[PDB]
Amino acid sequence: LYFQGSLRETSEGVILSVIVAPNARETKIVGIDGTRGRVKVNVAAPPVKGKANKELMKFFKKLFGAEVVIVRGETSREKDLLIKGITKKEVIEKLE
Ligand SMILES: [Cl-]
Ligand code: NA
């Protein structure tokens, strides 16, 4: 997997662009959507009541060891996550 099309480094940190597939057995990175420039993430939650947002952010805060917030897409499948205070190098190392 090449994650460089799904990330950009901003003033505040790194914006990781994902597309969520809900209702999964396990939350996990499964591939790259190159048409969207987004990481495909299976999410073990239903897509109701913010449960997929909660699971998604829990999984990524654990992975990066950084504050993760949804900056765009709270009610979309295509969510942009700001990982505050981190470089793109560090995020790519963690995604790999
Ligand atoms: Cl910027
Ligand atoms: Na949700």
Query: Could you tell me the domains of the chain?
Result: 4-95 (3.30.1200.10)
CA–CA dist 15, 23 (Å, integer)? 24
Q: What is residue 93's three-state secondary structure?
A: helix
Using the mean position of ligand 1's atoms as its centre, give its distance from the Cα of residue 85 in Å.
12
Q: What is residue 51's three-state secondary structure?
A: helix
Residue numbers after which the chain is interrupted (C to N above 2.5 A) read none
Using the mean position of ligand 1's atoms as its centre, give its distance from the Cα of residue 41 in Å.
25
Give the C-alpha distances (Å, rounded to integers) separating 19 from 6, 28, 45, 81, 85. Answer: 10, 12, 14, 11, 23
Experimental technique of record: X-ray
Give the C-alpha distances (Å, rounded to integers) separating 21 from 55, 66, 69, 77, 86. Answer: 12, 23, 18, 7, 26
Query: Which resolution, in Å, applies to this structure?
Result: 1.5
Q: Which residues surround ligand 2, an ion (CB under 5 A)?
A: 50, 52-53
**CB contact set of 20 (below 8 Å; sequence gap of 6+):** 41, 43, 47, 52, 56, 77, 78, 79
**Which amino acid is it at 21?**
A
